[PDB]
Amino acid sequence: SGLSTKSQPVIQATLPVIAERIPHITPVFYGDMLQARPDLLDGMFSRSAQRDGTQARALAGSIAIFAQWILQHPNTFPEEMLSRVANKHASLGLQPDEYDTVYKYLFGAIAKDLGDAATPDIVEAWTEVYWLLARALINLERKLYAQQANNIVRAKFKLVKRTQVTKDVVDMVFEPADNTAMTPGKAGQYISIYARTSDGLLQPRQFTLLPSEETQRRIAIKLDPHGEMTTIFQNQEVGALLDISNPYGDMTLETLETDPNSPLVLICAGIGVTPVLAFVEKLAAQKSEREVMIIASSRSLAEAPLRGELLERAKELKKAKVLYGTTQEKDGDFVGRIDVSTLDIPANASVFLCGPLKFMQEMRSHLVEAGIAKHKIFYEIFG
Ligand SMILES: Cc1cc2nc3c(=O)[nH]c(=O)nc-3n(C[C@H](O)[C@H](O)[C@H](O)COP(=O)(O)OP(=O)(O)OC[C@H]3O[C@@H](n4cnc5c(N)ncnc54)[C@H](O)[C@@H]3O)c2cc1C
Numbered sequence: 001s002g003l004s005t006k007s008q009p010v011i012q013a014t015l016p017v018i019a020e021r022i023p024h025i026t027p028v029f030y031g032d033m034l035q036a037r038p039d040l041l042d043g044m045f046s047r048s049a050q051r052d053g054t055q056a057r058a059l060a061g062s063i064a065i066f067a068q069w070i071l072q073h074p075n076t077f078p079e080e081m082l083s084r085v086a087n088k089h090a091s092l093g094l095q096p097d098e099y100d101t102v103y104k105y106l107f108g109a110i111a112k113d114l115g116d117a118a119t120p121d122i123v124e125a126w127t128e129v130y131w132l133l134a135r136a137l138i139n140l141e142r143k144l145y146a147q148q149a150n151n152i153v154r155a156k157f158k159l160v161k162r163t164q165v166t167k168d169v170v171d172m173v174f175e176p177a178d179n180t181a182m183t184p185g186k187a188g189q190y191i192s193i194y195a196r197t198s199d200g201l202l203q204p205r206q207f208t209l210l211p212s213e214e215t216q217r218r219i220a221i222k223l224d225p226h227g228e229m230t231t232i233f234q235n236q237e238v239g240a241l242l243d244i245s246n247p248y249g250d251m252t253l254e255t256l257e258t259d260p261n262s263p264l265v266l267i268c269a270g271i272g273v274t275p276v277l278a279f280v281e282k283l284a285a286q287k288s289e290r291e292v293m294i295i296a297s298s299r300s301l302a303e304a305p306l307r308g309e310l311l312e313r314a315k316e317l318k319k320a321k322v323l324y325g326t327t328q329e330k331d332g333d334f335v336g337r338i339d340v341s342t343l344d345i346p347a348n349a350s351v352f353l354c355g356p357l358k359f360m361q362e363m364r365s366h367l368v369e370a371g372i373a374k375h376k377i378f379y380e381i382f383g
């Protein structure tokens with residue numbers, strides 16, 4: 001059952017008002033919920049995302065995007081958004097009963113904001129929208145959990161190897177420290193790793209899995225000088241115990257391969273190399289015949305994380321080319337910004353982007369201007 005005929009005109013008429021009030025409703029929703037359920041800050045919600053504010057708007061904002069979608073495309077869902085959210089939720093171990101929690105505090109905040117304007121017709125219609133989306137996500141998350149090799153949401157790992165590989169990137173290898181079986185990861189997937197803040201709150205962050213033994217989880221963490229957890233993760237000593245989630249994510253090598261022989265173009269900046277290296281290592285293990293073009297940006301070659309390993313893996317591919325651009329020093333294959341018009345990208349190529357939001361926005365724009373189909377551009381936001 002999709003969006004009811006009764007609710008459609010109400011959602012249609014109130015969508016602008018609701019979208020306008022979302023930034024105001026969000027902090028009240030979270031403030032109320034996290035006062036009643038402080039346990040949810042100790043292992044689930046990111047304190048930094050609450051303090052930044054804009055980030056935390058995504059939950060309610062996706063509800064507005066969803067409402068607009070089901071009005072334009074009835075009995076269908078924005079599957080890309082649902083899949084991304086479900087994989088994140090599964091990484092964080094979200095259980096279906098908590099959708100009742102979010103409903104309670106979200107709609108309480110709607111009531112507080114709108115006051116007497118929150119009449120039954122409006123609350124009824126938006127409640128229907130909420131539960132359509134919640135049910136879809138719950139169903140996706142249930143299927144994700146069924147794929148795992150274990151029945152937990154995170155398990156204890158020991159840090160067995162730690163290497164400072166650039167001025168601000170630490171390459172970390174973990175192995176299980178309890179007897180929980182590991183789910184095999186797919187190239188491009190990430191894990192959530194957990195540590196406590198200085199004042200004792202458990203907090204997760206996501207990192208892309210890197211080539212390792214099947215008995216290991218390997219990640220490369222770039223220091224965010226204005227973030228809370230990367231300093232904590234990078235200061236763990238060998239032997240430290242941290243919890244790691246099961247692996248998830250829908251931005252995998254299979255997602256980029258639309259047909260058996262389509263070429264791949266992988267474009268990254270900074271620590272956005274991490275899915276690229278995962279993809280290249282897998283393609284090399286598969287003895288892929290695809291044409292693979294890798295364009296990586298860094299401030300300098302010395303600051304390019306994992307460049308040596310990426311180049312070694314790329315040498316194993318039949319038809320791979322790697323080009324590094326340097327944006328501060330002049331030692332790259334090229335200097336300055338990637339100019340995609342110079343690239344010969346055919347209409348059957350898939351293009352993958354991973355870098356800072358601004359970098360990806362400019363690349364996506366210039367790709368579209370150069371005639372690359374939006375449907376062929378795939379991206380991975382780190383945050
Ligand atoms: C799928 C996925 C894969 C990822 N893979 C990698 C990877 O391989 N390597 C990697 O290095 N990272 C990766 N990331 C990013 C990573 O998950 C973290 O976002 C990143 O490491 C920053 O974490 P942090 O705790 O240091 O920053 P956070 O504490 O989360 O802060 C992030 C930003 O929030 C703002 N902020 C923080 N505190 C406040 C405050 N008090 N007030 C206002 N604003 C504030 C700042 O602008 C800050 O830069 C990935 C993310 C995702 C979603």
Ligand code: HEM
Pocket residue numbers: 040044045046049056058059060062063084085088089092094098099100101102130133134137383
């Ligand atoms: C219909 C209900 C919900 C919707 C539409 C929704 C939507 C979203 C979206 C869009 C994101 C960002 C995904 C991304 O980063 O790409 C997100 C992240 C997140 N969600 Fe959900 N969500 C819902 C329910 C819940 C519930 C019930 C919980 C827990 C009680 C929860 C906890 C989280 C957490 C912890 C994050 C990580 C970001 C953060 O720490 O703030 N969500 N959600």
